[PDB]
Amino acid sequence: GVEGFNCYFPLQSYGFQPTYGVGYQ
């Protein structure tokens, strides 16, 4: 369900935080 690697972690919540792993312009 997670776009990409299967990470149970709240990777979707980090999409709003500063990080290179979530650089969606």
Neighbouring C-alpha atoms within 13 Å toward the C-beta of 25? 0
Q: Count CB atoms within 10 A of the CB of residue 22.
A: 13
Q: Sign (positive/negative) of CA torsion 11, 17, 20, 23?
A: positive
Longest pairwise C-alpha distance within the chain: 24
**Structure token digits, residue 15:** 């999409």
**Structure token digits, residue 11:** 């990777």
Distance between CA atoms of residues 25 and 6, nearest Å: 22
Neighbouring C-alpha atoms within 13 Å toward the C-beta of 13? 4
b/e per residue, 7-19, with b = 16+ CB within 10 A?
A: eeeebeeeeeeee
What technique determined this structure? NMR
Length of the chain measured in residues = 25
**Structure token digits, residue 25:** 């312009």
What is the CA angle 8-11-14, rounded to 5? Answer: 150
